[PDB]
């Protein structure tokens, strides 16, 4: 991989299902077109400054996991344990639930042309996509990656159709909706901070660019150069897709819409309007098939320290798959869609994710005073992790001060539920702990035929 194929993996990773669901909720909180395009550009700066700080932490430590070896080196075991606990029950199953809910919005929308589908149909189709992907990835480990490259080709084509056909309409003079773009707006701290939750969901994947883009021809120079080129170029493709939405829709017509890109393909591509519900539905289960490849990597490295159960990250003897972890993620993601509702799972996801993005980037500054003499090949200027940890407390405190809903209580109580399990199973190892953990591991071993992975740390 050179430099050009280094920035191509960055563009393919960061373009996901977010740009097809998020424009409604950014406009719902900043009610004008003008502020709606500033938040889409300011989210691409938070993704670029955030990925640069993770690029320094990735070369300084050089250990597998996620943010788990980064938090242990800075604070110790207690924030490292809470990240392994919150990524098990909060972060990873909600990400699997938002994607499978976004798949069922785009299948059910062309059948209910001028009205909404009922909530029983979008939820019973989303649960059928969770249980289909959780069994396909639990049987046929290599089948998920043969279809993975035609699911990325279907994603970039339908993005390039919307961008190009929007610049053609912009040249003909369909620019009336941009005329008064700053009249009627919100400088409330809860309207802007939730508009940042939905824009930054469309950039999901900037914190895992380290592990796959460090097998390059010349690292420590081409990795921070692929981030400065790659993530601002997807920021240009996200602004140009919102510009294309506002050539055929008013800001009121976009709020009164079920899926935003079906409404685009119904006013532009008229005799072939079904290609937009077809290509987005392919690209969305490909984004859910891709998150089941990663099942078991953090669970293995957290269980090696005693911070996670060891019956998870076991491997099936036939069909060599991480079957106890894939089944565990499919069960919690199915529970999450019964209360359901994208715009209520994105707030639940972004509150726990940005609490631990903020603790990790703060650990970059703590390790500049505590963990010197540690050979940093990449070294960002100090003003970049300071701004990224000041926005990270603005994105945590401002929804729970100004617009408090019930998900910010159910997310805090699920993270502090793990702090009880630290002090009974890790810090104060008692007697009754391992005689619950060992018969459960023994009986789930004969049920699923799963063994320890004949392996080493790597």
């Amino acid at each position: 991989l050179g430099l050009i194929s280094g920035i191509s993996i960055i563009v393919g990773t960061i373009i996901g299902s977010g740009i097809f669901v998020s424009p409604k909720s950014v406009l719902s909180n900043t009610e004008a077109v003008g502020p709606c395009l500033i938040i889409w550009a300011a989210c691409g700066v938070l993704a670029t400054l955030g990925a640069l700080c993770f690029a320094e932490l990735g070369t300084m430590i050089t250990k597998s996991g996620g943010e788990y070896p980064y938090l242990m080196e800075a604070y110790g075991p207690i924030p490292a344990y809470l990240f392994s606990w919150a990524s098990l029950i909060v972060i990873k199953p909600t990400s699997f639930a938002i994607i499978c809910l976004s798949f069922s919005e785009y299948v059910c929308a062309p059948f209910y042309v001028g009205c909404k589908p009922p909530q029983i149909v979008v939820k019973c189709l989303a649960a059928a996509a969770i249980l289909f992907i959780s069994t396909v990835n639990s049987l046929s480990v290599r089948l998920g990656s043969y279809v993975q490259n035609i699911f990325t080709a279907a994603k970039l084509v339908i993005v390039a159709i919307i961008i190009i056909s929007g610049l053609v309409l912009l040249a003909q003079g369909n620019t009336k909706n941009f005329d008064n773009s700053f009249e009627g707006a919100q400088l409330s701290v809860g309207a802007i901070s939730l508009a940042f939750y939905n824009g930054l969901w469309a950039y999901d994947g900037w914190n895992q660019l380290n592990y796959i883009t460090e097998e390059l021809r010349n690292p420590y120079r081409n990795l921070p150069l692929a981030i400065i080129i790659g993530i601002p170029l997807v920021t240009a493709c996200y602004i140009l897709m919102n510009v294309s939405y506002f050539t055929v829709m008013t800001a009121t017509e976009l709020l009164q819409s079920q899926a935003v890109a079906v409404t685009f393909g119904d006013r532009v591509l008229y005799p072939a309007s079904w290609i937009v519900p077809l290509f987005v539905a392919f690209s969305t289960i490909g984004a859910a098939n891709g998150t089941c490849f990663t099942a078991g990597r953090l669970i293995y490295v957290a269980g090696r320290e005693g911070h996670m159960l060891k019956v998870l990250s076991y491997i099936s003897v036939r069909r060599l798959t991480p079957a106890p972890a894939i089944i565990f993620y499919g069960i919690i993601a199915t529970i999450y869609i019964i209360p359901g509702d994208i715009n209520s799972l994105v707030n639940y996801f972004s509150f726990a994710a940005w609490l631990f993005y903020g603790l990790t980037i703060l650990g970059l500054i703590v390790m500049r005073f505590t963990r010197k003499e540690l050979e940093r090949p990449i070294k960002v200027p100090v003003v970049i992790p300071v701004l990224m940890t000041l926005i990270s407390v603005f994105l945590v405190l401002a929804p729970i001060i100004s617009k408090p809903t019930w998900e910010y209580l159910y997310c805090v109580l699920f993270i502090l539920s793990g702090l009880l399990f630290y002090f009974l199973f890790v810090h104060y190892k008692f007697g009754w702990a391992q005689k619950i953990s060992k018969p459960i591991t023994m009986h789930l071993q004969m049920l699923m035929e799963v063994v320890p992975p004949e392996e080493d740390p790597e």
């Binding site: 042309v113 001028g114 008013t250 009121t252 017509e253 009164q256 119904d266 008229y270």
Partner: protein
Amino acid sequence: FGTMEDFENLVAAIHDKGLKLIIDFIPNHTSDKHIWFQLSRTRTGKYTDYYIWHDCTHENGKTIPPNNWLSVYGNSSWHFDEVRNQCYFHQFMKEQPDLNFRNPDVQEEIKEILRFWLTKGVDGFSLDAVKFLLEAKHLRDEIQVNKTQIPDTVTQYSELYHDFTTTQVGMHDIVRSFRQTMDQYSTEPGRYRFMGTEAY
């Protein structure tokens, strides 16, 4: 009522509150100051058959009409034009000459007016006086309600049976072709175009 910019600001403001807008449409007749009628009575081009013209015997201040047909507001429905030296038909008033809907150039001009307002963003139309669209081309006299009445005193509209001037064969097909013109602007979901007719 304002300008065209005042209308375009009203359509945008109506849509921003979730409302819809339907307007009236008058297909049956124009004014005598319309540019089609000023070219019709000089026999200019294709406009010669845009209105219904027939010969008559107007001399010393009185016209002899081609039949006994009456206007709705009540006198003869034929009025003599001095430039054309013929008589034209009108269902309502002498300042409202009727369009000739047996001419396919007239029906194409009406479809361009429908496409003009649907492009501006109007959500529908109410069609007025659709039963007065076609008349019988045999031009025979109506039947009087009172058959012993002398025909020089029959001047009120309620004194004739209007079998040849309302609801003729082919009138419902003209209304159905208007519905097909608006169907090209209704293929988008949520932007169906309404059509209502007023026949009282």
